[PDB]
Design a protein around this ligand. Structure first.
Ligand SMILES: [K+]
Ligand SMILES: [K+]
Ligand SMILES: [Zn+2]
Length: 389
């Protein structure tokens, strides 16, 4: 076939010691164990096309910068970085989303972290000397070494803002990509399905204040009683506009070309034996938004900043710590997603592909949350039984 499973390389993961994740693992131990499970279903089936971030090949000024960062001087790295050519593709696609000054701060931060080997800035972000480089490799590897349909395991993105990171997210790779795709191609129909139990609030901010010119449909499934603890009255406040009831306690907002759908896991609950209506929506909306793109002779681009911390078998506080308790068995059914939902979700999407493979530009699946080792080492295989076929 034609997919690609990007993973961070071993030298890369070895710079993520100490970076916060949602449980007892740090992002090192997490991504170590996940690439292990992919090394499992890759010796089960050497067709699973896994590539590390090391087959990425960067321009000499970038590698020069990383090398200069190691020599410990902030001023030389910055003047060096400042002297990058403004038409370098990487730089061009970063500045489409982030500020230069945030970038420089990540460079200052990486060098300052050289003192004790890490820099804790806010209890949700930890920076290491390697951290800038490993993210550049992660993003570049996806931007140019992409190819249609692409699974990237790597740091989280959706809580990262234009001039700052939060909730484990340093850089918003999902937005850098999307901006990059509309860069010089005919106007696309951008469709986003962010299944992380937490809210795609950084992404949405970035999309809302810079991409109000493109056709985006951001379907955001999240539980408002967990981080970032923002509800429909909040989102009514951002968009300066009351939400439009799309049925089933689901509300859409519009900021120009952006149309943001809050499928609230707590307002929108599973009817008894059924599949969770959240995914059910995503598939219906999607299928609709594709036909709309065929009608307007326009192409589509799909993005899945998905986390598994919305699976019913997560244990992490950002998934199960709601309203003062941990969700019991029963409540886990009606508000969290199960393997049958996911096997329905992904099986659906992949099925939609071959009916409109022409009318696709590229699809991208980006790991976000997911923290219980048992739960993710299994959903990973579930994805790999499905990416296989
Ligand atoms: K979080
Ligand atoms: K979400
Ligand atoms: Zn999450």
């Amino acid at each position: 076939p034609n997919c690609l499973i990007q993973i961070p390389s071993a030298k890369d993961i070895q710079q993520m010691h100490g970076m916060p994740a949602g449980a007892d693992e740090d992002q090192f131990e997490r991504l170590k164990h996940m690439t292990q499970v992919i090394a499992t279903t890759q010796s089960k089936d050497p067709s699973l096309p896994v590539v590390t971030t090391d087959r990425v090949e960067l321009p000499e000024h970038w590698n020069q910068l990383f090398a200069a960062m190691k020599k410990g001087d902030e001023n030389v790295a910055l003047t060096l970085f400042a002297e990058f050519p403004e038409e370098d593709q990487i730089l061009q696609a970063l500045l489409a989303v982030h500020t230069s000054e945030y970038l420089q701060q990540i460079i200052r931060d990486c060098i300052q972290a050289q003192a004790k080997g890490w820099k804790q800035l806010n209890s949700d972000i930890l920076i290491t000397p390697g951290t800038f480089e490993v993210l550049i490799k992660d993003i570049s590897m996806t931007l140019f070494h992409s190819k249609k349909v692409h699974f990237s395991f790597g740091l989280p993105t959706h809580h990262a803002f234009a001039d700052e990171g939060s909730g484990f997210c340093i850089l918003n790779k999902s937005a850098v990509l999307l901006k990059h795709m509309q860069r010089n191609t005919k106007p696309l129909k951008h469709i986003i399905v962010g299944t992380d139990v937490n809210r795609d609030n950084g992404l949405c901010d970035i999309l809302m204040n810079s991409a109000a010119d493109m056709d985006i449909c951001h379907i955001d499934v999240f539980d408002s009683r967990v981080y970032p603890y923002q509800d429909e009255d909040y989102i009514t406040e951002l968009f300066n506009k009351c939400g439009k009831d799309e049925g089933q306690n689901i509300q859409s907002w519009q900021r120009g070309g952006l149309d943001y759908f809050v499928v609230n896991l707590s307002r929108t609950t599973r009817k008894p034996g059924l599949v969770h209506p959240a995914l059910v929506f995503a598939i219906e909306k999607m299928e609709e938004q594709i036909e709309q793109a065929k009608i307007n002779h326009q192409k589509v681009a799909l993005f899945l900043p998905t986390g598994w911390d919305s699976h019913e078998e997560e244990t992490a506080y950002c998934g199960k710590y709601v309203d003062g308790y941990l969700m019991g068995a029963t409540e886990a059914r009606k508000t969290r997603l199960n393997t049958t939902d996911l096997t329905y979700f992904y099986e659906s999407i992949f099925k939609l592909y071959r009916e409109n493979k022409d009318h696709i530009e590229k699809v991208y699946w980006g790991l976000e949350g997911g923290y219980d080792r048992k739960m993710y080492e299994q959903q990973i295989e579930l994805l790999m039984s499905i990416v296989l076929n």
